[PDB]
Structure 1
Amino acid sequence: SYKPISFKTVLVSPGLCISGDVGIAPKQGYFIKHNDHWMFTGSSYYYPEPISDKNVVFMNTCSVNFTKAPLVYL
């Protein structure tokens, strides 16, 4: 069995609206803040990776309580 031995506390987000009412959500992980731009992180190992479409489930519209950031493009 896989087993962690150390931990780190970070601020996460389950999704965000990035364009004209579109939604993105992580496949298995979270979105984290790093200097005014968001990156994906796996849910069992802390490693910032750039925003891709292979780790993101697209949405036709985002939820009302998702974070708002028109700056992120995809």
Structure 2
Amino acid sequence: AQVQIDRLINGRLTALNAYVSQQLSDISLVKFGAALAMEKVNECVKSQSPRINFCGNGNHILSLVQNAPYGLLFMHFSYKPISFKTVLVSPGLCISGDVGIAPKQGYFIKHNDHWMFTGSSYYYPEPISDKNVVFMNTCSVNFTKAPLVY
């Protein structure tokens, strides 16, 4: 009976060791998932960290968090374009005294036969101003030559 019980003890102890090892691995995974969830709470819900696809794929606007069984559920809200327009744009202009200007989060477009600015994620021509322009004392080559701007 002692040798039979010893065989059972050895089998049961090996099974418990295997379960403990698998539990350690799973709990490491849970710890790192929870670290990721805390990062998402800090950087998607409570603030919007300047990281592109951290808080869900796409043009992330904002995120919210709700309680879930054994975890958190995050609601990632994104800016989804619906319809598009093909428009000729310029990534920079050489204006006035050879001063270079680049569009700030947008593009330079020709609307009504004169240079205007439009945002990159929504077609809406705007007057060119220092609010939407990065200034350069010397214009980059291949910038569209626009001596009549400003």
Q: TM-score, normalised by structure 2?
A: 0.47
Give how far 1:50 is off.
0.5
Instruction: State yes or no: 1:50 paired with 2:106.
Output: no
Tell me, in whole angstroms, the C-alpha distance in 2 between the residues paired with 1:66 and 1:56.
14
Give how far 1:15 is off.
0.5
User: Deviating runs (4+, > 6 A) in structure 1?
Assistant: none
Tell me, in whole angstroms, the C-alpha distance in 1 between the residues paired with 2:104 and 2:142.
19
Gaps spanning 5+ residues in structure 1: where? Answer: none
What residue is the counterpart of 1:10 in the other structure? 87
Whichever of the two has the greater Rg, that structure is 2
Give how far 1:30 is off.
0.2
Which protein, 1 or 2, shows the higher relative CO under an 8 Å CA cutoff with sep ≥ 6?
1
Tell me, in whole angstroms, the C-alpha distance in 2 between the residues paired with 1:36 and 1:68.
14
| Per-residue Cα deviation, 1:11-43 (whole angstroms, up to 9, x for no partner) | 000001111111000110000012331000000
Tell me, in whole angstroms, the C-alpha distance in 2 between the residues paired with 1:6 and 1:26.
22
Tell me, in whole angstroms, the C-alpha distance in 2 between the residues paired with 1:38 and 1:25.
12
- Higher share in helix: 2
Q: State, as a whole percentage, how many aligned pairs show the same letter.
A: 100
Q: TM-score, normalised by structure 1?
A: 0.93
User: What is the aligned residue count?
Assistant: 73
- Higher share in strand: 2
Paired residue secondary structure (1:54): helix
Gaps spanning 5+ residues in structure 2: where? Answer: 1-77
Paired residue secondary structure (1:35): coil
Superposed CA RMSD:
0.8
